[PDB]
Design a protein around this ligand. Structure first.
Ligand code: PC8
Ligand code: PC8
Ligand code: PC8
Ligand code: PC8
Ligand code: PC8
Ligand code: 2IL
Ligand code: 2IL
Ligand code: 2IL
Ligand code: 2IL
Ligand code: 2IL
Ligand code: D12
Ligand code: D12
Ligand code: D12
Ligand code: D12
Ligand code: D12
Ligand code: D12
Ligand code: D12
Ligand code: D12
Ligand code: D12
Ligand code: D12
Ligand code: D12
Ligand code: CL
Ligand code: CL
Ligand code: CL
Ligand code: CL
Ligand code: CL
Ligand code: CL
Ligand code: CL
Ligand code: NA
Ligand code: NA
Ligand code: NA
Ligand code: NA
Ligand code: NA
Ligand code: NA
Lengths: 311, 311, 311, 311, 311
């Protein structure tokens, strides 16, 4: 078994297609996702051509070892895919129709800049290395590219599964390589984040701001310092589901900003008490009254600036 | 080895059966469950027929490679099942009786809307792709569908294991596909949730309401703020065992509602103190006395509304 | 290769034996344990009989594929065992002596009712399905059932490894099945639980009871509320190592009872303060003095009732 | 392929040798370690002897299937080792020189009594079961026992890798078994424990003792109760990296002792307050002044007693 | 199949090359990284020489089993690599051009002394053991050493992937071994650490220093003790992502130093209160005023000393 020889000196076109059966385990920290799909391959092998009238059979079924099959691999995989050959069909002209069902863990990077209001473009890169006798080029058979309706990815909305029809043909270690880009467009379901993380986080922050309606330093210390512990808990809970990014994220910016607001609240609480002890509560009262308006206003304006910069 | 030819142009019926031996590892967050079961297959292959008289044997045993066996796969699996062929028996008329024992991780989504008082319908989808020569259709042999009495799923009550007898026959990549729906009905054992989560959660909430029988702002701050830390702990403990849902859950609604009640309690504690400092405790006392009745009543009524909406 | 034919119409007896080499990874939450052992099988195959005088050999060694070997499987396993055939020996009468070394993850449920003073009976179920030509029945060769001296299961004391000699012979999917019960008796090492969990838990509970020797509401609130946070930490630490049970456990009952005692302590602390503020400390003093005796007495009596109900 | 027959009656000596290439993943909780090493085997097979003159080759290379190779297994492994045969060489006299490269997870118990100032003796048990025709005995070829210089075990110092030259020959299921003990001596690197765990733990304990220089019950309660929460955190952090032992550990005793010191400190704080409320601060002052000396002295003496009992 | 014989007593040179396709999962605690790459091998085997005129092909393709292939292994791997042979090409002279695509978990130690501002030199060691008949030596084909542009390692910047061209030829167990060092230079992306860990950690430390502007012992105790709980949380969060090192790390030194600063702050808070109770606030005021300047100055100077010692 060797590659089919060229009629003239044209490269061998292998038509490809991926049909998603299952999409699961999207690990944000690891930037990986598991996929279970059909991989369809089609090429012309004139050595396998037959007469349909004399053979009496329209199609001829073959075992993988019986014929030449192109070595198609995935670029962005952890380990080589687990494949099960479903069917091999040969038409009278020698056109081969290969079909396998595979499962693979795909390495595809994510952009956390807009998290949890982010959309991602997941990639599946198909590749073929050219042999010495002839060069192999990949193609997209749009009729064999898709996903089943039941394909669900927990916490995500699946937009589209398409392929960039033009392959990236490049030289690697003195041989030609034909690469195809299969793109899975997904957008994060941000609903849950509001009553589970966003609203409870704002509530604990508003609790610290009740210290602006109190002169009791011991109670104010308790209010601001204790809610800071809850803020630290929410910060840790959020950052454990996210990887360390070399760029600032929308959530990252907000979290950092809340740390500043807590620090400024501690300063206010310290200043108010110092002036009270220094027998000048009229100065303390004016600062505290200003803080009641300043803190929510500056917080609301800063969040508008952040939302604008990130979206 | 190729599929058995048709007598007349009828499709090939493959009778199926699944008998559950072991049911384990129901991962709520991952929405997966592990299953160890018997898979029985039966089809007529006239090429394998024999005369029981001249053969001297009523049945003929074959090795998988010796005969044609239909390529049956599972739709909603992570990876292809781990199968061990138990027995292959051929009757004189050519009826084949296949039996294998498999283990597989099944991807089946869960509805957490009523958690932890929820019931689930787990699915196992059997499938067969039609070949060139003839079309393969699946069937349910009710006599070979079941589960053993010992089959236990930790934290769940197993109701029934049945199959939808009518297959979903559809075209996929220019070939016919026959799909069967095996349904495992289960209901969650909610007992443990009451003394472990529900009752302790209500106790910490009632402790915060003792601030309505105190005028001591420092003590009230301590009571409401510290019990909030415990509520955050319980919130985190519960949400780690649940996936992020694009819908509101019964538990989710309650958790969120408790965050509102804590926020309103902080407001009351802030108001009571402000009026006390403003030398008007008669106003503070009337608000605090009203809160003693209002807080449990509104909490009890809101929970009735939530139980009604979710159930 | 087919099963040995019967002399007269008796079933085929396969003598079994399991000898434990390694016992490890007892997962309480998962209710599973890993086992590495020898599996010995013995049956009579008269087709393999030979004369020892003319053959000059007392024993004949065979490869697995050369002869018929019964398909023995485990019922309560996650996946099919990882076996390595050690030896196959045939005696002159045709008695086959099979030996393999296997490793398997066993699914065996645990009774947490008396945890951590619980004992468990772990099970390993051996099974054989009867073939069409003849029926296969399992037996226990007591001389080939055991465990090595070094077999250690971390945090457990291994009592005995025995087998119920009488097999459970039953019909399943119109064929006979012979099941054997191998029982591994173990008891939990409860030593560590006393200085690590029990005594520190009682200490934090006793710290809350020091509030019955104080009139300072702010200090009492701090004492009872802060130790409740520690009580929650211990509750979470314990329940993470245990699965969700549909029955009440000994530890579960105690944990729940401590939550009641904390709630009653908050009520006492609230009542004592209210009466003091209401300018009647004589009533508060009598309640507080009674609580000093009542709380440890009721706690000690309730624990006696719980220990009696559970043991 | 069968074992080499004896010249006289003597057993077959298989010379063994393990050369460690990689040592990693020492799991304390699981009491396991991963090893990647060379396994060398040598035995005389006279059936393979050749004349170096007639053959023209001083050595003969064989494939595993071509010749008889003894079935050598590891006793204390989770699953059977993953082996790759490197070389098989036969000398003219028939001496076979086998070499394989393996990887295996080894089950070896640890003694936590002196943790984190503990040393361990890890074990690798080589074994061979005697066949029907002749008995196989293991031996140690000291020239082929070693480890490479780069072999590093994270958080441990590797002392020596030696083997007990005399095998443990015993009967198991009526056949002889020859066992060899390969010992890997390691000692824990306790450096990190001092500035990371020990010193910070003493600091939080000393902070609780500052309550002996204060008469403020509310501040004292805060000091002793809050540092207890930190002590609980450190207790949990330490015990999660350790398995549940049926014996007391050095660390375990200290941890338990600190819980006693916290309880006694709460008693002192309770007593001091009661006497001051009872209008007798002279009694309270004498107890508090004594506690300032008593607490560090009794703590220092008790630790000397513990270090003496454990080392 | 045996090694190619020498023309003139020279060793067999195997030209090697590694081309990285995917780099992922750099586990700091485990000191391992996963790699998916191309492994190219080239050696002369004159026994495979052919005349393209007689064979009708300029290059011959072979299956791995058909010809002799050198046994190349990796030194610092957990388990043997998962390899898929891509192509084997033989030119008329008998020069073999082998290509495989492998995936492997590599054991490479890291130096955490400068963490999180550290750079690492990851290693991949290629090795070949010499056979009886002739000695095998490794070489680096620089044209076949590289990495693709998309190769991304989460949280790291990939500097270079080069190989030490001169192999380390040494004797091991009576046979020659040729080792090659493939070096992957990486540097940690320290950006995220500043707003996520560094700045929030400094904020909680500055909050404790507000106790130097207060005379309220109860408030000061709350400020210093509560922020210590947050400092413990940050310490635990950081040390869980790092292994236990026998050397002091830059982060380790800082963490330890913060524990000292908290202890000294508790001493100051204790001293200030004692003098105030001893009716000498003039002494307490002078210490507290000095602490306001001393604490940030000594902290800033000590950090300069630490940064200097570590960088
Ligand atoms: C403390 C901060 C609170 C969070 C505030 C909400 C943040 C926000 O502005 O989210 C916007 C987001 C919609 O994202 P998209 O519209 O999908 O982003 C693409 C936008 N373009 C192409 C124009 C650049 O999602 C929404 O539509 C917002 C709905 C959630 C409202 C939450 C209220 C608390
Ligand atoms: C943490 C805050 C919890 C406070 C509320 C406590 C009561 C509680 O939650 O549980 C009620 C729940 C039963 O309600 P559901 O059966 O789940 O209602 C279904 C709605 N339909 C069927 C009409 C579509 O479950 C039960 O089994 C009720 C018994 C609970 C007993 C404990 C005291 C609540
Ligand atoms: C706050 C609660 C503290 C716990 C109190 C101890 C609980 C207790 O009584 O445990 C009993 C247990 C022995 O169990 P077993 O004897 O193994 O159970 C079999 C019992 N029968 C007779 C029915 C067949 O174990 C013992 O022997 C008890 C040893 C532990 C003592 C701990 C003291 C703090
Ligand atoms: C609160 C408890 C504080 C900890 C006190 C230190 C514990 C201690 O004494 O450790 C001793 C240990 C050395 O152990 P080894 O010498 O390795 O054990 C063998 C001992 N023989 C053979 C003689 C019986 O290690 C040492 O050499 C001591 C180094 C640690 C110093 C810690 C200072 C805080
Ligand atoms: C409480 C402690 C605060 C942390 C202080 C910052 C630590 C620091 O100085 O980090 C230096 C680091 C750059 O290191 P490198 O230049 O990459 O290391 C090589 C240096 N030589 C070869 C000269 C020895 O990284 C930087 O360039 C520093 C950027 C981070 C600034 C953080 C401000 C909060
Ligand atoms: C009578 C005062 C009613 C106050 C109601 C508070 C409204 C908060 C709205 C939050 C929306 C999410 C602020 C808290 C303010 C506490 C109230 C001060 C007491 C004044 C007594 C006179 C947080 C924002
Ligand atoms: C004599 C007062 C007895 C009060 C008993 C409290 C009953 C709580 C029932 C909870 C059911 C679950 C509320 C707590 C009320 C504390 C009691 C106030 C002290 C009044 C002193 C006069 C929580 C509901
Ligand atoms: C001088 C009084 C000494 C009291 C010693 C407390 C004994 C606790 C026994 C625990 C057994 C384990 C109780 C706490 C008791 C606090 C001490 C009250 C001080 C009264 C001063 C007069 C806990 C039960
Ligand atoms: C001027 C007093 C200086 C006190 C210095 C404390 C030394 C602690 C040494 C710890 C060694 C590790 C104790 C804390 C003592 C606090 C100091 C009491 C204030 C007295 C005011 C007069 C903990 C041991
Ligand atoms: C009018 C006083 C303004 C104080 C501003 C504080 C600036 C902190 C800069 C941190 C940089 C990162 C210190 C906190 C000092 C609190 C302010 C004392 C109140 C004095 C009242 C007169 C922490 C450094
Ligand atoms: C408390 C924060 C409320 C702010 C809500 C902003 C929602 C923006 C939606 C923009 C859709 C394009
Ligand atoms: C005061 C800081 C407490 C931080 C607690 C974080 C809890 C994280 C749990 C994450 C489980 C997935
Ligand atoms: C306010 C601090 C809340 C911390 C809660 C931590 C809960 C972690 C649960 C982990 C279970 C796996
Ligand atoms: C159909 C069964 C409904 C049972 C409802 C029980 C509700 C109990 C609420 C108690 C709240 C503390
Ligand atoms: C502090 C609680 C002490 C209770 C000890 C009970 C021990 C029961 C032993 C029963 C053995 C049969
Ligand atoms: C008073 C604050 C208590 C915070 C305890 C947090 C515990 C976090 C556990 C996280 C386990 C991963
Ligand atoms: C209210 C604070 C509760 C803290 C819970 C700590 C749980 C730690 C679990 C650690 C599991 C390894
Ligand atoms: C703060 C505790 C310091 C105790 C140090 C003990 C060091 C013992 C060294 C023993 C070497 C054999
Ligand atoms: C009361 C505070 C308990 C804190 C327990 C913290 C547990 C941390 C475990 C982290 C494992 C990675
Ligand atoms: C608050 C700490 C600020 C210190 C920043 C130091 C940055 C040093 C940069 C050195 C680059 C070589
Ligand atoms: C009282 C201090 C509690 C500190 C707990 C820190 C928990 C960190 C958990 C991080 C899990 C990735
Ligand atoms: Cl692949
Ligand atoms: Cl499948
Ligand atoms: Cl099995
Ligand atoms: Cl082994
Ligand atoms: Cl013996
Ligand atoms: Cl023997
Ligand atoms: Cl390798
Ligand atoms: Na092929
Ligand atoms: Na077949
Ligand atoms: Na067989
Ligand atoms: Na307080
Ligand atoms: Na062999
Ligand atoms: Na080869």
């Amino acid at each position: 078994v060797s590659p089919p020889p060229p009629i003239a000196d044209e490269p061998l076109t292998v038509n490809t297609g991926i049909y998603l059966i299952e999409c699961y385990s999207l690990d944000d920290k690891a930037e990986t996702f598991k996929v279970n799909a059909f991989l369809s391959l089609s090429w012309k092998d004139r050595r396998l051509a037959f007469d349909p009238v004399r053979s009496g059979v329209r199609v001829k079924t073959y075992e993988p070892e019986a014929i030449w099959i192109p070595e198609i691999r995935f670029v962005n995989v952890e380990n080589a895919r687990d494949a099960d050959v479903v069917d091999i069909s040969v038409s009278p002209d020698g056109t081969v129709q290969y079909l396998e069902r595979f499962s693979a863990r795909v390495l595809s990077p994510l952009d956390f800049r807009r998290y949890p209001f982010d959309s991602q473009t997941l990639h599946i890169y198909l590749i073929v290395r050219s042999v010495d006798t002839r060069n192999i080029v990949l193609a997209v058979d749009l009729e064999k590219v898709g996903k089943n309706d039941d394909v669900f990815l927990t916490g995500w909305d699946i937009e589209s599964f398409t392929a960039v029809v033009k392959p990236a043909n490049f030289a690697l270690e003195d041989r030609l390589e034909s690469k195809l880009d299969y793109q899975l467009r997904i957008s994060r379901q941000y609903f849950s984040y509001i009553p589970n993380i966003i609203l409870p986080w704002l509530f604990i922050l508003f609790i610290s701001w009740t210290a602006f309606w109190s002169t009791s330093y011991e109670a104010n210390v308790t209010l601001v310092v204790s809610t800071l512990i809850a803020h630290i808990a929410f910060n840790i809970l959020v950052e454990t589901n996210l990887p360390k990014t070399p760029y600032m994220t929308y959530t990252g910016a907000i979290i950092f900003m809340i740390y500043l607001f807590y620090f400024v609240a501690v300063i206010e609480v310290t200043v108010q008490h110092y002036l009270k002890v220094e027998s000048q509560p009229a100065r303390a009262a004016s600062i505290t009254r200003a803080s009641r308006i300043a803190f929510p206003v500056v917080f609301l304006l800063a969040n508008i600036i952040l939302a604008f910069l990130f979206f």
